[PDB]
Design a protein around this ligand. Structure first.
Ligand SMILES: [Mg+2]
Ligand SMILES: [Mg+2]
Ligand SMILES: [Mg+2]
Ligand SMILES: [Mg+2]
Ligand SMILES: [Mg+2]
Ligand SMILES: [Mg+2]
Ligand SMILES: [Mg+2]
Ligand SMILES: [Mg+2]
Ligand SMILES: [Mg+2]
Ligand SMILES: [Mg+2]
Ligand SMILES: [Mg+2]
Ligand SMILES: [Mg+2]
Ligand SMILES: [Mg+2]
Ligand SMILES: [Mg+2]
Ligand SMILES: [Mg+2]
Ligand SMILES: [Mg+2]
Ligand SMILES: [Mg+2]
Ligand SMILES: [Mg+2]
Ligand SMILES: [Mg+2]
Ligand SMILES: [Mg+2]
Ligand SMILES: [Mg+2]
Ligand SMILES: [Mg+2]
Ligand SMILES: [Mg+2]
Ligand SMILES: [Mg+2]
Ligand SMILES: [Mg+2]
Ligand SMILES: [Mg+2]
Ligand SMILES: [Mg+2]
Ligand SMILES: [Mg+2]
Ligand SMILES: [Mg+2]
Ligand SMILES: [Mg+2]
Ligand SMILES: [Mg+2]
Ligand SMILES: [Mg+2]
Ligand SMILES: [Mg+2]
Ligand SMILES: [Mg+2]
Ligand SMILES: [Mg+2]
Ligand SMILES: [Mg+2]
Ligand SMILES: [Mg+2]
Ligand SMILES: [Mg+2]
Ligand SMILES: [Mg+2]
Ligand SMILES: [Mg+2]
Ligand SMILES: [Mg+2]
Ligand SMILES: [Mg+2]
Ligand SMILES: [Mg+2]
Ligand SMILES: [Mg+2]
Ligand SMILES: [Mg+2]
Ligand SMILES: [Mg+2]
Ligand SMILES: [Mg+2]
Ligand SMILES: [Mg+2]
Ligand SMILES: [Mg+2]
Ligand SMILES: [Mg+2]
Ligand SMILES: [Mg+2]
Ligand SMILES: [Mg+2]
Ligand SMILES: [Mg+2]
Ligand SMILES: [Mg+2]
Ligand SMILES: [Mg+2]
Ligand SMILES: [Mg+2]
Ligand SMILES: [Mg+2]
Ligand SMILES: [Mg+2]
Ligand SMILES: [Mg+2]
Ligand SMILES: [Mg+2]
Ligand SMILES: [Mg+2]
Ligand SMILES: [Mg+2]
Ligand SMILES: [Mg+2]
Ligand SMILES: [Mg+2]
Ligand SMILES: [Mg+2]
Ligand SMILES: [Mg+2]
Ligand SMILES: [Mg+2]
Ligand SMILES: [Mg+2]
Ligand SMILES: [Mg+2]
Ligand SMILES: [Mg+2]
Ligand SMILES: [Mg+2]
Ligand SMILES: [Mg+2]
Ligand SMILES: [Mg+2]
Ligand SMILES: [Mg+2]
Ligand SMILES: [Mg+2]
Ligand SMILES: [Mg+2]
Ligand SMILES: [Mg+2]
Ligand SMILES: [Mg+2]
Ligand SMILES: [Mg+2]
Ligand SMILES: [Mg+2]
Ligand SMILES: [Mg+2]
Ligand SMILES: [Mg+2]
Ligand SMILES: [Mg+2]
Ligand SMILES: [Mg+2]
Ligand SMILES: [Mg+2]
Ligand SMILES: [Mg+2]
Ligand SMILES: [Mg+2]
Ligand SMILES: [Mg+2]
Ligand SMILES: [Mg+2]
Ligand SMILES: [Mg+2]
Ligand SMILES: [Mg+2]
Ligand SMILES: [Mg+2]
Ligand SMILES: [Mg+2]
Ligand SMILES: [Mg+2]
Ligand SMILES: [Mg+2]
Ligand SMILES: [Mg+2]
Ligand SMILES: [Mg+2]
Ligand SMILES: [Mg+2]
Ligand SMILES: [Mg+2]
Ligand SMILES: [Mg+2]
Ligand SMILES: [Mg+2]
Ligand SMILES: [Mg+2]
Ligand SMILES: [Mg+2]
Ligand SMILES: [Mg+2]
Ligand SMILES: [Mg+2]
Ligand SMILES: [Mg+2]
Ligand SMILES: [Mg+2]
Ligand SMILES: [Mg+2]
Ligand SMILES: [Mg+2]
Ligand SMILES: [Mg+2]
Ligand SMILES: [Mg+2]
Ligand SMILES: [Mg+2]
Ligand SMILES: [Mg+2]
Ligand SMILES: [Mg+2]
Ligand SMILES: [Mg+2]
Ligand SMILES: [Mg+2]
Ligand SMILES: [Mg+2]
Ligand SMILES: [Mg+2]
Ligand SMILES: [Mg+2]
Ligand SMILES: [Mg+2]
Ligand SMILES: [Mg+2]
Ligand SMILES: [Mg+2]
Ligand SMILES: [Mg+2]
Ligand SMILES: [Mg+2]
Ligand SMILES: [Mg+2]
Ligand SMILES: [Mg+2]
Ligand SMILES: [Mg+2]
Ligand SMILES: [Mg+2]
Ligand SMILES: [Mg+2]
Ligand SMILES: [Mg+2]
Ligand SMILES: [Mg+2]
Ligand SMILES: [Mg+2]
Ligand SMILES: [Mg+2]
Ligand SMILES: [Mg+2]
Ligand SMILES: [Mg+2]
Ligand SMILES: [Mg+2]
Ligand SMILES: [Mg+2]
Ligand SMILES: [Mg+2]
Ligand SMILES: [Mg+2]
Ligand SMILES: [Mg+2]
Ligand SMILES: [Mg+2]
Ligand SMILES: [Mg+2]
Ligand SMILES: [Mg+2]
Ligand SMILES: [Mg+2]
Ligand SMILES: [Mg+2]
Ligand SMILES: [Mg+2]
Ligand SMILES: [Mg+2]
Ligand SMILES: [Mg+2]
Ligand SMILES: [Mg+2]
Ligand SMILES: [Mg+2]
Ligand SMILES: [Mg+2]
Ligand SMILES: [Mg+2]
Ligand SMILES: [Mg+2]
Ligand SMILES: [Mg+2]
Ligand SMILES: [Mg+2]
Ligand SMILES: [Mg+2]
Ligand SMILES: [Mg+2]
Ligand SMILES: [Mg+2]
Ligand SMILES: [Mg+2]
Ligand SMILES: [Zn+2]
Lengths: 154, 112, 116, 101, 14, 59, 140
RNA sequence: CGUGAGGGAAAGGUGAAAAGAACCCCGGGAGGGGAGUGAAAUAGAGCCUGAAACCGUGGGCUUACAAGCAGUCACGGCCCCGAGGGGUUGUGGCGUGCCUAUUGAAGCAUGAGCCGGCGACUCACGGUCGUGGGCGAGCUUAAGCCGUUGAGGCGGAGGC
RNA sequence: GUGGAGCCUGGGAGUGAGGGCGCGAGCGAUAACGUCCGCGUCCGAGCGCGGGAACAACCGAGACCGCCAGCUAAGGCCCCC
RNA sequence: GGAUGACCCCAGGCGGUAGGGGAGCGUUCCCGAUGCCGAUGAAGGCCGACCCGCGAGGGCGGCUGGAGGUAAGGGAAGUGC
């Protein structure tokens, strides 16, 4: 009611008007007036303990492994940037698009190939996060990206 | 078969036209005419227009016979009011409502 | 996000007014006057359920009395008669017997007198 | 030939064929239970004091139901006290088969 | 809300 | 005066009940002997201009 | 089982001789006959009682000094409109009203209570005009 | 609106497409009735959906000897749907509106004509208990920095 | 004496206008629906139920819901009832 | 009782203002969702004497409507007159 465009004039006298008393038309009791406890820009972030983020990361990968859904690959053979090249490779490693994959690799080329698949979330090892590990059904990493994962939960 | 007419937005007070309409509901088209011609009411003129229009609809459009027409149903609905300012003493403004009417007459055929 | 009233109040008001069907004037058209009407309506129903139990037992007792005096005793004598006789037919049935099976009621009178 | 039987803490007059709703008996549907007789009448009068010894009333259990819903409402004025309770009394339907005696 | 008609003075109840 | 005022709003039942005397009497009409058109008694006939059995004015 | 509710029965006419009976203790009994509470099928919300014809109402009896001291009142609704009429007077002028008044005040108030009063035919003197109904003389 | 500084509104939506209704009928016109367009015209421009108060036409029950916070309980009658249910209410029973403020209100104490929508315990940072987890003689980072483009990490200054 | 008893630590309160009645006093006039304390009770918050014609605090009695079953309480049993 | 809400049995408590505590319903919005429901009809409206729930409500059916809606499980609030 202080940030609203109206004036601060009392609309009519306090007494003897036969009407209810009011001040200015900015008061939240009026149509078009201010908002009593409406939102204001907020910072929803907060500092989660690092060990909670390291345990959770390890634990998310652990969950997938205990399901037999974690698959480490040494390299992506024909994949040189083309989507048809990743699908070809995909079928060879048993990934037939009936399961959500989190492709985790520092290979710029291989991530270009698998970007557009509606069943692949694509990611670099530095970005490994549990929300993306858990929202996908299977997990696939480089031996290079797996080495990087081992550092972070060390 | 039925023939209907509707005069929408007649600038007259619904409560006032109804008095005239109540005279003719259920009367035959011939009595309804004589009754309307000697009703001492502004509303008579508007009802007569709607009545003769409904009768024209019957004969012309719906293959009904003038000699057998009666006023099977009629009613007056209230339409949107014209709101006007009426000045009073000591600086006060009153809102006159110039009300409006939707007059309806439905004729049927009184066989036999 | 903003959660405007939207659809909620109308549906709550309609629940009242449907329960209020049959009421006089605004008590079935105005949501306020319906709701007030139903407060009283609900408490009368609670009270009169209790009262119905008393209402009917009164009727039976009056009906038993009249059938009793035909054989020349009053309710208070008949009832104490059946107590000593061991008879535990209740007032709802003693009254239907009094009216439907007078021959059966007449014997019950005789057990009552005889067992004093 | 009627019997005044007692079941569920209440008393009812019953004749062969009569369908009757009483309080909920613990008894599978289609089973048969015997009712206690307090009076017999019609072609002969037998007056229990309180229960007729030999007699009983044979009943068939057609089913078990819940009655129509009574709204149990409470209101105390000037005290914002309001209570809404929906109640359905459980019952048992019986078919009066015969009156033993 | 144009002009505020001032109300009549009360009866002096003193 | 001290400006009398209505104390409650009048119910639809009391309002319309006050109007229980508000219906119009349909006009009194009789046939004209000359042109058989319906018209009020004791007036010159506006359709043929006849009264008491003679022409009285142009129409 | 629902409680028995009778169908409409033709009512029984009775005939009481008030000669020498005490005003109030007779009114009790006429009241009950009018309510029909002597009938084992009594129902509170219907007129199902007896038609009660009374004779010799002039010869009704009262105890104490009530002839001089009992006062009937009628208030006309006008200022000073309270009339007091004592028993002696009321017997000397409208004797049937003595017993009429006593029973009417021992009947319910309300629509059904008022109909019951209609079913009471009190007469001064030993004769009544209801021979067509052949009333059943009672001893009370 | 205000002399003036200044105050300060209301008001969005046809349809996929104007195909936005030729022509004929009543009418001064307005408005309608046919015809026609459209999937749809109670989508016809006073146009999506079309709630409620409010007004009306028609139908079922009911009401002119009756005492009333308007209901509730019971029975009976009539109408409707097809050992039951719905509508209505004739008689009998019982019955002191809502909110508020009060020791105490049906109260002749406050507020409210009625309906629809707007309308009042929140956020930030600090604290103090409690609680779910992580770690434990230890726990934890801030500003920044790198990455990401809804990826996370580094950073030990400092705090307890 | 195992009870919505008690004790200890701690989180959240509300209340800090009472009122009638019985009894014990003061004030008052061996006045007040008066006033001020004490002991108890009810109303408050049980304006829910029965009785007392009607009626917060008098008598009966502490309403979880249903029953067209039974026994009582105060108070009642000539008719309204 | 069985074995740590799986349901059964027995017993007891369950009037309530200020107020404390507990469990739920519904609203808007996010994840679930590149999904699923949807012109063989979304949301919204109007009926229902039917189904579930103590209740707040939720279903289902008919009419209206004509293009959106959104689960199990969680998350956040301009959340109920
Ligand atoms: Mg301002
Ligand atoms: Mg400003
Ligand atoms: Mg400005
Ligand atoms: Mg400005
Ligand atoms: Mg200012
Ligand atoms: Mg100013
Ligand atoms: Mg003032
Ligand atoms: Mg003021
Ligand atoms: Mg005012
Ligand atoms: Mg005002
Ligand atoms: Mg005002
Ligand atoms: Mg006003
Ligand atoms: Mg105001
Ligand atoms: Mg003011
Ligand atoms: Mg204000
Ligand atoms: Mg203001
Ligand atoms: Mg201020
Ligand atoms: Mg302001
Ligand atoms: Mg604004
Ligand atoms: Mg604020
Ligand atoms: Mg926070
Ligand atoms: Mg993509
Ligand atoms: Mg993708
Ligand atoms: Mg995916
Ligand atoms: Mg005239
Ligand atoms: Mg013509
Ligand atoms: Mg003037
Ligand atoms: Mg003027
Ligand atoms: Mg002037
Ligand atoms: Mg006006
Ligand atoms: Mg006006
Ligand atoms: Mg108008
Ligand atoms: Mg709101
Ligand atoms: Mg209604
Ligand atoms: Mg009704
Ligand atoms: Mg009613
Ligand atoms: Mg109404
Ligand atoms: Mg209504
Ligand atoms: Mg209405
Ligand atoms: Mg209630
Ligand atoms: Mg009950
Ligand atoms: Mg009797
Ligand atoms: Mg006994
Ligand atoms: Mg007994
Ligand atoms: Mg019989
Ligand atoms: Mg039952
Ligand atoms: Mg109730
Ligand atoms: Mg109360
Ligand atoms: Mg109140
Ligand atoms: Mg009350
Ligand atoms: Mg309240
Ligand atoms: Mg109070
Ligand atoms: Mg309340
Ligand atoms: Mg309230
Ligand atoms: Mg409940
Ligand atoms: Mg004057
Ligand atoms: Mg003057
Ligand atoms: Mg004046
Ligand atoms: Mg009036
Ligand atoms: Mg009105
Ligand atoms: Mg009306
Ligand atoms: Mg009305
Ligand atoms: Mg009036
Ligand atoms: Mg008038
Ligand atoms: Mg009229
Ligand atoms: Mg006698
Ligand atoms: Mg009777
Ligand atoms: Mg004497
Ligand atoms: Mg100017
Ligand atoms: Mg100017
Ligand atoms: Mg605007
Ligand atoms: Mg458009
Ligand atoms: Mg458009
Ligand atoms: Mg389309
Ligand atoms: Mg266009
Ligand atoms: Mg022309
Ligand atoms: Mg035209
Ligand atoms: Mg037309
Ligand atoms: Mg046209
Ligand atoms: Mg279609
Ligand atoms: Mg439509
Ligand atoms: Mg449309
Ligand atoms: Mg559209
Ligand atoms: Mg429309
Ligand atoms: Mg419209
Ligand atoms: Mg009507
Ligand atoms: Mg009379
Ligand atoms: Mg009558
Ligand atoms: Mg009854
Ligand atoms: Mg029926
Ligand atoms: Mg009925
Ligand atoms: Mg009644
Ligand atoms: Mg209220
Ligand atoms: Mg105050
Ligand atoms: Mg005060
Ligand atoms: Mg009052
Ligand atoms: Mg008043
Ligand atoms: Mg005042
Ligand atoms: Mg008031
Ligand atoms: Mg005040
Ligand atoms: Mg107030
Ligand atoms: Mg006022
Ligand atoms: Mg209204
Ligand atoms: Mg409102
Ligand atoms: Mg707070
Ligand atoms: Mg805020
Ligand atoms: Mg805290
Ligand atoms: Mg904490
Ligand atoms: Mg930790
Ligand atoms: Mg650390
Ligand atoms: Mg306790
Ligand atoms: Mg305690
Ligand atoms: Mg504490
Ligand atoms: Mg707490
Ligand atoms: Mg708290
Ligand atoms: Mg305080
Ligand atoms: Mg203190
Ligand atoms: Mg203080
Ligand atoms: Mg104090
Ligand atoms: Mg004190
Ligand atoms: Mg004090
Ligand atoms: Mg007192
Ligand atoms: Mg005292
Ligand atoms: Mg004493
Ligand atoms: Mg002292
Ligand atoms: Mg005192
Ligand atoms: Mg005293
Ligand atoms: Mg005390
Ligand atoms: Mg208080
Ligand atoms: Mg008490
Ligand atoms: Mg207490
Ligand atoms: Mg009380
Ligand atoms: Mg009171
Ligand atoms: Mg009491
Ligand atoms: Mg009392
Ligand atoms: Mg009292
Ligand atoms: Mg009390
Ligand atoms: Mg007893
Ligand atoms: Mg005793
Ligand atoms: Mg009696
Ligand atoms: Mg229990
Ligand atoms: Mg407990
Ligand atoms: Mg208890
Ligand atoms: Mg409680
Ligand atoms: Mg929820
Ligand atoms: Mg989640
Ligand atoms: Mg999405
Ligand atoms: Mg589909
Ligand atoms: Mg289609
Ligand atoms: Mg459809
Ligand atoms: Mg929705
Ligand atoms: Mg929505
Ligand atoms: Mg529903
Ligand atoms: Mg729908
Ligand atoms: Mg779309
Ligand atoms: Mg959602
Ligand atoms: Mg959910
Ligand atoms: Mg937010
Ligand atoms: Mg708000
Ligand atoms: Zn002529």
């Amino acid at each position: 009611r202080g940030e609203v465009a109206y004036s601060g004039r009392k609309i009519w006298p306090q007494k003897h008007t036969g009407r209810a008393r009011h001040g200015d038309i900015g008061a939240p009791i009026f149509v078009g007036g201010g908002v009593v406890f409406g939102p204001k820009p907020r910072d929803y972030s907060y500092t989660l303990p690092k060990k909670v983020r390291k345990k959770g990361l390890a634990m998310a990968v652990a969950d997938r492994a205990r399901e037999g859904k974690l698959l480490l690959v040494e390299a992506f053979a024909g994949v040189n940037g083309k989507t048809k090249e990743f699908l070809a490779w995909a079928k060879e490693a048993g990934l037939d698009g009936s399961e959500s994959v989190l492709l985790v690799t520092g290979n710029e080329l291989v991530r270009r190939a698998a970007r557009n698949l509606p069943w692949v979330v694509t990611l670099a090892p530095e970005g490994l996060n549990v929300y993306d590990i858990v929202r996908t059904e299977r997990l696939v990493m480089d031996l290079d990206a797996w080495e990087v994962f081992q550092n972070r939960i060390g | 078969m039925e023939a209907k007419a509707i005069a929408r937005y007649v600038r007259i007070s619904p409560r006032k036209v109804r008095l005239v309409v109540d005279l003719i509901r259920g009367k035959s088209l011939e009595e309804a005419r004589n009754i309307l011609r000697y009703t001492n009411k502004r509303g008579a003129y508007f009802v007569a227009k709607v009545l003769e229009s409904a009768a024209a609809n019957a004969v012309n459009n719906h293959d009904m016979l003038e000699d057998r027409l009666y006023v099977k149903a009629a009613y007056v609905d209230e339409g949107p009011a014209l709101k006007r300012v009426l000045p009073r003493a000591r600086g006060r403004a009153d809102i006159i409502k110039k009300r409006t009417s939707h007059i309806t007459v439905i004729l049927g055929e009184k066989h036999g | 996000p903003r959660a405007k009233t939207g659809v909620v109040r109308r549906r709550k008001h309609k629940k009242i007014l449907k329960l209020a069907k049959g009421y006089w004037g605004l008590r079935s058209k105005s949501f306020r006057k319906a709701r007030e009407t139903l407060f009283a309506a609900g408490n009368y129903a609670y009270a009169h359920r209790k009262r119905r139990k008393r209402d009917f037992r009164r009727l039976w007792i009056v009906r038993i009395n009249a059938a009793c005096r035909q054989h020349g005793l009053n309710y208070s004598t008949f009832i104490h008669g059946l107590k000593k006789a061991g008879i535990e037919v209740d007032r709802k049935n003693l009254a239907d017997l009094a009216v439907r099976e007078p021959q059966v009621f007449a014997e019950l009178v005789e057990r009552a007198k005889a067992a004093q | 030939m009627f019997a005044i039987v007692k079941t569920g803490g209440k008393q009812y007059r019953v004749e062969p064929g009569l369908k009757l709703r009483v309080e909920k008996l613990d008894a599978e549907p289609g089973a048969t239970v015997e009712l206690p007789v307090l009076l017999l009448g019609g072609e002969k009068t037998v007056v229990g004091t309180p229960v007729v010894e030999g007699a009983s009333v044979v009943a068939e259990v057609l089913g078990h139901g819940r009655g129509k819903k009574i709204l149990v409402s409470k209101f105390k004025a000037k005290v914002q006290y309001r209570r809404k309770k929906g109640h359905r009394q459980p019952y048992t339907e019986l078919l009066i088969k015969e009156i033993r005696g | 809300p144009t002009y505020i008609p001032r109300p009549r003075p009360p009866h002096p109840r003193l | 005066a001290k400006h009398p005022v209505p104390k409650k709003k009048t119910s639809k039942a009391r309002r319309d009940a006050r109007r229980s005397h508000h219906a119009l009497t349909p006009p009194t009409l009789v046939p004209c002997p000359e042109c058989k058109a319906m018209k009020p008694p004791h007036t010159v006939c506006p359709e043929c201009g006849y009264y008491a059995g003679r022409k009285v004015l142009e129409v | 089982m629902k409680t028995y509710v009778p169908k409409q029965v033709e009512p029984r006419w009775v005939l009481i001789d008030a000669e020498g009976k005490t005003l109030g203790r007779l009114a009790t009994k006429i009241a009950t006959l009018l309510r029909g509470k002597h009938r084992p099928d009594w129902t509170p919300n219907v007129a199902m009682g007896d038609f009660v014809v009374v004779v010799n109402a002039d010869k009704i009896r009262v105890t104490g000094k009530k002839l001089e001291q009992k006062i009937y009142t009628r208030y006309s609704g006008y200022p000073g409109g309270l009339k007091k009429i004592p028993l002696e007077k009321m017997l000397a002028t409208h004797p049937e009203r003595v017993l009429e008044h006593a029973v009417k005040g021992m009947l319910p108030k309300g629509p059904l209570g008022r109909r019951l009063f209609k079913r009471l035919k009190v007469y001064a003197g030993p004769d009544h005009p209801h021979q067509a109904q052949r009333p059943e003389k009672l001893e009370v």
